[PDB]
Amino acid sequence: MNNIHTSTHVSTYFNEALVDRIDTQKYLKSNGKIKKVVSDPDNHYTAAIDDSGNITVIVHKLNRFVSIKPSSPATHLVFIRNGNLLVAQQNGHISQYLASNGKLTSVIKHHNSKLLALEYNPVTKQILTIANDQCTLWDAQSFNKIKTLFAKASYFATGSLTPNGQSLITSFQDGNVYVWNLNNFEVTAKSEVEENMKNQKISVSADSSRFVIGGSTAYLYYCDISHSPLCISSFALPSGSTSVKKIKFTHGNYLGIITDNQVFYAIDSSTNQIALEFRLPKNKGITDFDINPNNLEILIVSGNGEIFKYDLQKLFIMEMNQQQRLLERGIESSLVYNVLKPGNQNHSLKFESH
């Protein structure tokens, strides 16, 4: 007594104004549900990983899908300018197929890890993989390597590239977060931190003035390059938070956060406040999503066999309509949101970077 169920915070908005239908029965033949979406930086191809196999790529104009026979699920997919798809498999290998045919072109291996987190930088042609104790970085063509950047001390936790700019940010098991000179194996930017975060990814804004750090602990660390240290502040999250699995960025001030309390959050960095708070069901839970950064169009695969076709601006205006009616009455959205405030220095991930 009395927990919060079912799909009351997800399908209830996501299906609000659809212009098409996902004929779910077309895609879900498994005794099972979609657990993750691995996806296209160009958003449209949203592949569905289930608990069965044949990872598919769902194509949302055709109401058809790409069937890529092998069962091996991805940690993430990268689709690029020329029609190719790179699949970072959970099997330790990254398999590239032509996205358009599902035809294998190459496999990248170097990683010996359960995690091969991907990020793609379309302006470097570089694909980065976060795995084991390193960052393998390579030409997006994915037939060679440029180099691997390494953590030779405490265990590597994670890292990410800047997609409409150029940098690599990585971190340690001890939360130390640092920035690399992408062409010199050089860490120019270093940190010493108190929050030790396991199971983290560092999310990078496309023009990386802004960064955020997730992890095994329920705290988020925030960066702004206009100020020193790059990581300036951090703070605790609304009650019930546990750990954070993923954060993505948009062109607005926004972080899209997947928290393992099975609630999606969206945060506005100008004060670092939570605009959106939306939960998913048991099976069929938070899966993952794609974004059009300038209207925040969302291409989310919900594990329920629904793809939305909702966006953050519509979900925001829904929340902001509540507020606009009350802005007329003086409501402060920062508190409505849960704006979180900077604390002390002894639990921070403060980081200097140039």
Place this chain on the structure above:
Amino acid sequence: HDPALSRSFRGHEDIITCADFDPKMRQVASCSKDSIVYVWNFKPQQRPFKFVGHKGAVYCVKYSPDGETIAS
């Protein structure tokens, strides 16, 4: 404002240990102390489904919150 015993689930040969609900309002789940669980709906014309398994006692049944799988 009545405790309202309404209409019982017929059968359930002996030995009853639990019940739960499918929030369609309602498919009722229940279970016995030997080899059987049941799931059925009212609108009494509906016939219940008798599940076979749990050759030992079934202590409790609960539905997933959406009323889909019945756990036993």
